[PDB]
Design a protein around this ligand. Structure first.
Ligand SMILES: [Cu+2]
Ligand SMILES: [Cu+2]
Ligand SMILES: [Zn+2]
Ligand SMILES: [Zn+2]
Lengths: 153, 153
């Protein structure tokens, strides 16, 4: 794949549009877009395993993790494929998202197409929280909005 | 893939859940589930090209058609990959979908993961309407509900 898009929606005010682009079947994935409705500050931003919206964001499952690693930040060697870290919302509740990641992919074994993008209630502690939950979700809390990742024109 | 799912939602009362399962790469895809809120009778049922929900079902674009063929019914050689024909709603407004198709796939060039499933306003004429629109959309009319096709557990 080359271009993909995800529309985040939830039961609250959080909504956004996140694009993904991958020039090469191997490489870096550019991820960008905007999310509104958020409390100012850091929010966990992850690719969850299943593109299943049958029970809202809950049915998305845990973080996409085909290498069976523990949770971390995007720069850690130890992390889930789906660990994209935090995004930052401004005082207007708006997160201008721009991330480049070489672990997720739009092709191959780490393909995230058909999976779910989630934006969280609180900051992802990137696996340094000192408890089991930190090693699973970064303590990012509830899922405020999500969308299935789909193929874009 | 083995298993994928799609949650259909739209601007009106149509909603449903559709499952797709494929056991061999080859291989035939079983499609099944329930759609409620429909007018009794025949409704067009297609996989559209983009998993892009940015502007409702409109942004899903045209029928998935990597072979650049004309619109047909699922039994036709001449058809788009996305042409699943009609589903039938009963007098309760419920379409209990059960289709088997070996043109769509959950992998390879005809993969529908990350594309959009749509259920339409009217019957799909299966490319037998005698006008240009018939050879494109089957004259199935408006898009009542759609969802991105996602990976299920
Ligand atoms: Cu998460
Ligand atoms: Cu259609
Ligand atoms: Zn994680
Ligand atoms: Zn068609």
């Amino acid at each position: 794949a080359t271009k993909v898009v995800c529309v985040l929606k939830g039961d609250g005010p959080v909504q956004g549009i996140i694009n993904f682009e991958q020039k090469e079947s191997n490489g870096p994935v550019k991820v960008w877009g905007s999310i509104k409705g958020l409390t100012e500050g850091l929010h966990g931003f992850h690719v969850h395993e299943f593109g299943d919206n049958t029970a809202g964001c809950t049915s998305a499952g845990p973080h996409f993790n085909p290498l069976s690693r523990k949770h971390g930040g995007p720069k850690d060697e130890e992390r889930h494929v789906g660990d994209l870290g935090n995004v930052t919302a401004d005082k207007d509740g708006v997160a201008d998202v721009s991330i480049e990641d070489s672990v997720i992919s739009l092709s191959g074994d780490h393909c995230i197409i058909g999976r779910t993008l989630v934006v969280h209630e609180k900051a992802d502690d990137l696996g340094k929280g000192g408890n089991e939950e930190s090693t699973k979700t970064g303590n990012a809390g509830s899922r405020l909005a999500c969308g299935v990742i789909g193929i874009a024109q």
